[PDB]
Amino acid sequence: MAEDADMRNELEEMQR
Amino acid sequence: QSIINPDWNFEKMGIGGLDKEFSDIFRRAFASRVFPPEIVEQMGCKHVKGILLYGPPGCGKTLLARQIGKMLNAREPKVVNGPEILNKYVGESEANIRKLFADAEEEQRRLGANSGLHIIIFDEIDAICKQRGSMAGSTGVHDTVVNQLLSKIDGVEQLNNILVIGMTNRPDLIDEALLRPGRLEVKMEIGLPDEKGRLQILHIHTARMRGHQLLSADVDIKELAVETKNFSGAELEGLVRAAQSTAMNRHIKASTKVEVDMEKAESLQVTRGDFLASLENDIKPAFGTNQEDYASYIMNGIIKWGDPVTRVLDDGELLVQQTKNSDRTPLVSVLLEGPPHSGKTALAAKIAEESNFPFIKICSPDKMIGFSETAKCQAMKKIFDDAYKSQLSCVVVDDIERLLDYVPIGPRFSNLVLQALLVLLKKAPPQGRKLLIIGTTSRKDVLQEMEMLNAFSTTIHVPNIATGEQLLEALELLGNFKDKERTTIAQQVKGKKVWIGIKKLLMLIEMSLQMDPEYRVRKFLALLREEGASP
Amino acid sequence: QSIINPDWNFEKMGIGGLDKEFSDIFRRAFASRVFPPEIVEQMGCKHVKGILLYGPPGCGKTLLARQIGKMLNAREPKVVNGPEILNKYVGESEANIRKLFADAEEEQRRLGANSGLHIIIFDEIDAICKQRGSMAGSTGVHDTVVNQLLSKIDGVEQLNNILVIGMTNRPDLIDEALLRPGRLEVKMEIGLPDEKGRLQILHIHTARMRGHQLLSADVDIKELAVETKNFSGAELEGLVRAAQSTAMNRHIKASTKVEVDMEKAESLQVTRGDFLASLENDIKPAFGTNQEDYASYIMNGIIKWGDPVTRVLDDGELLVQQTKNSDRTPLVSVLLEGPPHSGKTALAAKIAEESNFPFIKICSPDKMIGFSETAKCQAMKKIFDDAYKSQLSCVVVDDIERLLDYVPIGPRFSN
Amino acid sequence: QEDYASYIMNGIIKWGDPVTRVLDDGELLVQQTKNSDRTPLVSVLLEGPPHSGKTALAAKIAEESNFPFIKICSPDKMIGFSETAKCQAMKKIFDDAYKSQLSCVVVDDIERLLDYVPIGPRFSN
Ligand SMILES: Nc1ncnc2c1ncn2[C@@H]1O[C@H](COP(=O)(O)OP(=O)(O)OP(=O)(O)O)[C@@H](O)[C@H]1O
Ligand SMILES: Nc1ncnc2c1ncn2[C@@H]1O[C@H](COP(=O)(O)OP(=O)(O)OP(=O)(O)O)[C@@H](O)[C@H]1O
Ligand SMILES: Nc1ncnc2c1ncn2[C@@H]1O[C@H](COP(=O)(O)OP(=O)(O)OP(=O)(O)O)[C@@H](O)[C@H]1O
Ligand SMILES: Nc1ncnc2c1ncn2[C@@H]1O[C@H](COP(=O)(O)OP(=O)(O)OP(=O)(O)O)[C@@H](O)[C@H]1O
Ligand SMILES: Nc1ncnc2c1ncn2[C@@H]1O[C@H](COP(=O)(O)OP(=O)(O)OP(=O)(O)O)[C@@H](O)[C@H]1O
């Protein structure tokens, strides 16, 4: 088998 | 107030070879905005707000966009350089897209009909707009971006003061909902120029040198236009740049330190030798068949050792003319057959070269060593599609018995390639276009057994050297042996019949030359005796 | 201010064997930046913005790029080492590309046509600039980076103060739009040197030793140049380094404690025996040849037991002569056949050894045990591709019946 | 709509009796498949020597009818295909045909659709 490729990410912000 | 700048001229923008495309764009886009407003209102039509340009690299799309932006009397255009909209946080790409339409909406809501034009430019548009539901990873932002763009261009609210321009190299990857009428109507293709367009471009890119008297008087632009086949505008400009650099370099000395004469720098001239030298060693096109191919396929030229050499060429000329003129037979075919070492590939290449068609290609097995059946079929299909896109085309297929892997033991061969060839030999191009196919082989009976010989329109025979007179004429035309030696050779060959190919004779002569000066003709005659015959 | 440094000299670069390539690069890239500006303005010509260097490993591409960067009176260049721009967050690997062009744009907009030159170097360019798929469902891993680079190098906004340099070993994988006459217009191959270049390189790498009387006088550089056929620029430097190490080791004793005889280190000199020992035991080229293979294929020598041996050897010599001295027939082949155990492979090896060509290779089935036919084709193609990069080559194909997998029953073989 | 102009490129000329006869037969067959309930499926084969004009006549017969659904299956589109892709394409065409109340289908160049060669011979089963 072939190992799953690399992937991007999304990000979320938080206030204080 | 007109939308066209008062001081605008079509010759000021410096684009050559694209008069028809510009006429179409001007008619479809700016006709309504220049015509008097009352009659347009009486018609009740809306304006066009979209253009898409596509074509191969280096043909002048960005130049068109920039000059169109400069032509109009409006605000400074907005330009997006590729994927500048992407952001790492949630909702921030769509906000970036919505920031591009704010001023247009504000002015439409304030001044209504009496408002100016707003221009937006998308470069490399295929990066951000693709068919929805095609990416396996990171699609969540891409589909939302596409949806936001669609909802913004044409939605419940209506705008009438925006124009959008896009440029791409891969038009088939774009979403179909974006290309419907009302969003991006005017689709234009930019392609390679013809000879007159090349002449126009070449005139454009030398005007200042001609004006300031820096161009020599022996340079002829028409010869360059005829000579530079398959070139694009970028290559045509690069050739001039290379010539200028070559001209400049003659007044700079750089051995230890760099020095410039500054006395002979004045009276600088650009001559024809600079242009010729650059064409040889610097600039090379990236399309079609060029000199490097003809050099390999015809290595030792063509010599008229007999009558059939002209007969083959005459038949080829007749077939080429028939393809050119006839309209009820857009497709023609021919097969060149003969014994081995007779010179079929060179003659086919010569005929194709003399055809003078815009499109020429050669499909040979030596470019696909080690391929499987599917790869060979794919390569042939791609070449034939490229041929189809043209107007009148020529294609050459040599060494057919090597294209399908034939061996007498068995026999064994590839059936897939045979079926593909049989299907392609009887397929016609789109109406109004014409194609010529030339093929070469050395085993005609095998092709007859496979029922391929009936898919060709005609055949031409290529014979061997049969008599001593032709052999002596070939020797005379090569100039290898002196008259004294040729007398001895004629004392032996004229009383016999010979059976030898042109390609084998050169090998025999080069093998014989290695002997000492005393044993040259003797070795040559011994080898010729060893050859034998079998007409 | 002049673009070239006031103190620049060609001989200080330290590059031997590549005069023509440097001349072409200088003519195409820097001629218009050294000529007086008034005449260049009267011509209406733009400057060249791109160079590409390609070739096999070890021949001097990074050294050339570094020296070009050092020769110009400009800002400090920007260096990108392989895939150093890749990031995991969306939109972050293209901001890295855009950040490389900010200063050039700022200085252009500010100073017009009086700005300086900005250099950018891309090492291992093929790592990030492969061809775009152009098929639905077959999109590349990152085609947005390629699009950003293409838009930045040549776009709606015009820059005239940049120069980009790239280096690669696999030029056939790069995108086609990146190599057109407007982006990377000058493309150069860096290959193996000839005897003159080898002599130049040896002088360059021995000058400092010769300066301080640290080199013996039985050492002849012109002999070494003849003896080292088909060496790259790195292998010669390695040879010199190994000779120096051998010379130094004679004055150190190691075992109980490391001690240096700091009395005989004053009379230190490098002799012709160190070079000879290094050639035999340390450095082995890639496009050259060594004597061990011949010993493997000619095991018990060759003895003259009759007339046929001389005839075969003469026949081989005459074809060597023809292939060397012929222009109409650059390619010649021959087949040696006979009964089993008659000794034909050794005769072929002897003929190849006596040719005295720089490149000699032997293709044998002993190195293809268990291979499939596709792998055999790939190996043969690889062997034949290396030989096209030499001026004179000889190849030997042994045991054609074993290469085809022939058996009389059926019969069966690989087509 | 099928691009009938490609299959019929030089029209049809009544150079003799047989042409008319052929067309008549086709018309009759069409009538039978339109006004029959015991035989909801009908088939026919056109055979002759090479370069006789079978494809053009078949296309003309298909066109003259006024059926809602008409399609032509040709090997010109399946170039380099495996023997599974051809089956999938034929299955898709027939599945589309099944939907309509009245359907007509043309299968031309059957020998090229089976990859027939007289040496051995060879074909796809
Ligand atoms: N039709 C033309 N007339 C004159 N010059 C041209 C023409 N086409 C191209 N050129 C010259 O080639 C240069 C590069 O062309 P341009 O940038 O417009 O091409 P493009 O099609 O947008 O390129 P790509 O597809 O590679 O992004 C132009 O700046 C101009 O110098
Ligand atoms: N009159 C001529 N006709 C053809 N070739 C000629 C002629 N005069 C010289 N030649 C040279 O002879 C050689 C012909 O070789 P070519 O490859 O065309 O032969 P071929 O019969 O196709 O080969 P093969 O049987 O080995 O496949 C070329 O070098 C061509 O330049
Ligand atoms: N032409 C040359 N003249 C002098 N020294 C050379 C030459 N070529 C290589 N060298 C020496 O070899 C060293 C290593 O070569 P370099 O780093 O230039 O190779 P490269 O072509 O980039 O290699 P690779 O493709 O493996 O990365 C140089 O620093 C220099 O010392
Ligand atoms: N005059 C000679 N010619 C050839 N080989 C010789 C001669 N004298 C001694 N030998 C030795 O004979 C052996 C030749 O064996 P070689 O591998 O060439 O055989 P071969 O004919 O290829 O046999 P096969 O392939 O059937 O095993 C080598 O050891 C070679 O050193
Ligand atoms: N009376 C006619 N009947 C049939 N075809 C005709 C007639 N008059 C002209 N034609 C033209 O002759 C050609 C005959 O069609 P087509 O080439 O498909 O024949 P075919 O016998 O099926 O061919 P193939 O032998 O290649 O399988 C078409 O161009 C058709 O337009």
Residue numbers in the entry:
A (entry chain H): 1 to 16
B (entry chain D): 206 to 740
C (entry chain C): 206 to 620
D (entry chain E): 496 to 620
Tell me what the authors wrote about this structure, in their words:
To gain insight into the structural nature of binary complex formation and disassembly by NSF, we prepared a complex of NSF, ɑ-SNAP, and the binary t-SNARE complex (21bin20S) composed of full-length soluble SNAP-25 and soluble syntaxin-1a (1–267) in the absence of divalent cation (i.e., non-hydrolyzing conditions) and performed single-particle cryo-EM. First, models of the NSF D1 and D2 domains with substrate bound in the D1 pore were built into two high-resolution (2.88 Å, 2.92 Å) classes from a single dataset, differing only in the state of F protomer engagement with substrate. For datasets with particles collected under non-hydrolyzing conditions, NSF is found in two general conformations, primarily differentiated by their F protomer state (left column). Two high-resolution 21bin20S classes from the 2:1 binary SNARE complex dataset reveal large-scale conformational displacement connected to the D1 F protomer nucleotide state and SNARE substrate engagement. The first class is ATP-bound and fully SNARE substrate-engaged, while the second has a nucleotide-free and SNARE substrate-disengaged F protomer. The engagement of F at the top of the ring accompanies a relaxation of A into the split. Otherwise, the classes are nearly identical; protomers B–E D1 domains also bind ATP, while protomer A, at the bottom of the D1 split, is ADP-bound in both cases. Comparison of the two classes reveals limited differences outside of the protomers A and F positions, as the change in protomer F position allows additional relaxation of protomer A into the split. Two states dominate in the absence of Mg2+ (left); the top class (#4) has SNARE substrate disengaged, nucleotide-free protomer F, while the bottom class (#3) has SNARE substrate-engaged, ATP-bound F. With the addition of Mg2+ (middle), E is Mg2+-bound.
